[PDB]
């Protein structure tokens, strides 16, 4: 009934994995193979800063540059004649 | 806010938040590199002053221009 | 040192009573550096009416 042990250096402070059960794969034989092979080329961390950044800008610069009333009210532009100012201006 | 209320409140606020994070599951799996701390006194001093001045300037500017125009 | 109860000006510039008057309580006859124990009527910020000074940091006037 003593929580004070120098040899037991991990139980002491309370670094207990609260719900970290060490169970087997419940994940399927056919499906785990579908999604290992499919998500193995994008795996590497260096490739993400090359793909996600540059292809992500290519996602903004595509759906960003593609200019009419159909989708937004600015590329629509002014569809009426200019209004009169305060100092008799155009 | 930054001028009137000072550190001790905010740090203890943070003090409970930093416990709160560390025994929140799923979120547990994320931890900070840089320990979260309250801004200094001198920091609070500057940050108040800055907000105050910016607000001053911008408010007047909007008034000055909109009224004169 | 100065005679006990004599009115003495302080000449230590970093004192709260600098160029001010105090009375000598007792000058310790030993090898101590600040023997001249002075007591004043008015306190400092730190709620203290008394301090110790050296023989070159007093002048009986």
């Amino acid at each position: 009934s003593r929580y004070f042990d120098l040899q037991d250096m991990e139980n002491t402070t309370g670094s207990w994995d609260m719900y970290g059960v060490d169970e087997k794969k419940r994940y399927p034989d056919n499906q785990a193979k579908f999604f290992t092979q499919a998500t193995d080329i994008i795996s590497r961390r260096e490739s993400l800063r090359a793909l996600v950044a540059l292809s992500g800008i290519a996602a903004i610069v595509t759906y960003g540059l593609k200019a009419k009333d159909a989708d937004l009210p600015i590329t629509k532009g002014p569809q009426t004649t200019g209004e009169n100012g305060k100092g008799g201006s155009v | 806010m930054f001028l009137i209320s000072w550190r001790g409140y905010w740090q203890e606020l943070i003090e409970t938040l930093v416990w709160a994070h560390e025994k929140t599951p799923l979120a547990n799996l994320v931890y900070w590199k840089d320990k979260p701390v309250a801004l200094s006194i001198v920091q609070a001093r500057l940050v108040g002053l800055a907000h105050f001045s910016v607000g001053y300037i911008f408010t007047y500017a909007a008034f000055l221009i909109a009224s004169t125009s | 040192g100065p005679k006990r109860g004599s009115l003495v000006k302080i000449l230590r510039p970093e004192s709260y009573w600098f160029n001010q008057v105090g009375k000598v309580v007792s000058v310790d006859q030993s090898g101590v550096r600040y023997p001249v124990v002075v007591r004043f009527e008015n306190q400092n910020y730190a709620g203290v009416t008394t301090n110790n000074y050296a023989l070159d940091e007093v002048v009986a006037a």
């Binding site: 991990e10 207990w16 609260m18 994008i42 993400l48 800063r49 996600v52 | 025994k23 799923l26 | -």
Partner: protein
């Protein structure tokens, strides 16, 4: 008998084991989720988490958006595909800083024996998660607008 008790015996650890936290259930459900699993390689976890948020982000940007009163679901589609790719920057950049030399977790289980450390926290760890959050996210977004639209 007290419903609430000290943490796995120790009363001098910052926590209280309520029937909310520790119980017969909750300890079985949270382990069933992708992230908390210990024995699995770091590829399949990220996909099971990453996909899910692609559907939580998908519903939203359809019905509340600017083109809610009309391209309403095409509008909501790739916008859910976005918070995916930014999370991938956030999670790739989160990873870029932290891990320089070896892992760091509570090594043991509740039983207390020195179990092998997880790859959840490592140099090659968060990479495959950050990849899982991408391939899961981007693909997982597409199926909230192949089912609601197409």
């Amino acid at each position: 008998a007290q419903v609430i008790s000290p943490v796995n015996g120790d009363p001098f650890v910052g926590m209280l084991e309520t029937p909310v936290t520790s119980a017969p259930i909750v300890a079985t459900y949270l382990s069933n989720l992708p992230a908390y699993r210990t024995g699995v390689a770091p590829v399949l976890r990220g996909v099971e988490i990453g996909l899910a948020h692609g559907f939580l982000l998908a519903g939203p940007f359809i019905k509340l958006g600017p083109l809610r009163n009309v391209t309403a679901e095409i509008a909501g589609s790739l916008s859910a595909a976005g918070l995916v790719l930014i999370l991938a920057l956030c999670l790739s950049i989160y990873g870029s800083a932290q891990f320089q030399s070896t892992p760091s977790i509570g090594v043991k289980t509740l039983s207390g024996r020195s179990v092998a450390r997880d790859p959840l926290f490592s140099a090659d760890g968060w990479s495959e998660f950050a990849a899982g959050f991408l391939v899961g996210g981007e693909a997982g977004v597409a199926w909230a607008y192949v089912c609601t639209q197409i």
